Structure 1
Amino acid sequence: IYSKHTPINLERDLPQGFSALEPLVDLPIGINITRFQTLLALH
């Protein structure tokens, strides 16, 4: 679950630069994953 937070100027697209993604948490799960989905917080 490599992660990185970076400041941005404006919201057009991805910037130019090298932000190295430090390891954050390793998980010992070891299950079969082929598909994924992302939730949204609806009020």
Structure 2
Amino acid sequence: FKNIDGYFKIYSKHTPINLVRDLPQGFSALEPLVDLPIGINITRFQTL
């Protein structure tokens, strides 16, 4: 998630893993899925 000049950008990537510990060693990339012209002058967040 980025938020630059009102345009808030969301990249992502959904990928199969088999580990229960933490982020797995390897490489893959995240492709832009949404931009929004939100124009909100932002600071923080919280997950649901």
Same-fold call, TM cutoff 0.5: yes
Note the C-alpha offset of 1:31.
0.8
Gaps spanning 5+ residues in structure 1: where?
39-43
Which one has a bigger Cα radius of gyration? 1
Q: Please, what is the CA RMSD of the aligned residues?
A: 0.8
Q: How many residues align?
A: 38
Q: Structure 1 stretches (4+) deviating beyond 4 angstroms?
A: none
Structure 2: runs of 5 or more not aligned? 1-9
Q: Which has the higher strand share?
A: 2
The structural deviation recorded for 1:19 is: 1.0
Rounded to whole Å, the distance in 2 between the matches of 1:25 and 1:19 is: 19
Query: How much does 1:11 deviate?
Result: 1.1
* Per-residue deviation, 1:30: 1.5
